[PDB]
Design a protein around this nucleic acid. Sequence first.
RNA 1: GCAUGGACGCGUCCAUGC
RNA 2: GCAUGGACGCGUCCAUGC
Lengths: 70, 70
Amino acid sequence: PSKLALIQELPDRIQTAVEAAMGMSYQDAPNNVRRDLDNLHACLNKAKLTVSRMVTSLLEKPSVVAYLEG
Amino acid sequence: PSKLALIQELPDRIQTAVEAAMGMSYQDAPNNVRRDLDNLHACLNKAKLTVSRMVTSLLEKPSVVAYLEG
RNA sequence: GCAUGGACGCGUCCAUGC
RNA sequence: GCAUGGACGCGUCCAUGC
């Protein structure tokens, strides 16, 4: 796994790590708990988008990409 | 995989997703790049902590645990 | 100068638990 | 009050692009 490979795969992996939890069903959950599980969803989503943004941000930096290329 | 388990295994799942990347070394890169990679490390470490804290917050709620299993 | 990304600081608000 | 998440405001630092 190349240094550039590690970074290019982070977003995918984070997705994999989170899917199970997010894809959970709580349709029958009480109100307060529902509010909590929605919040969890928001949290996981923000985490995921934030890591994605950072990766994208990184690959656009020519200087960084050169280093991850030799 | 019970619902309560999907929340309990989030941290371990994220560790698996991230450990590789936030474990790579780059002491040989120029300052600007080394600095950009530390930023990545900081980003990842924070998302990792955010998930753990949320998972903890959920698990400390009688309501959520009670519902997560009936 | 403008914009983007991240980290951080101070604060306002919302939810949930105690 | 404290904890955790989320939205938002102002500011700091780092990096890149224009």
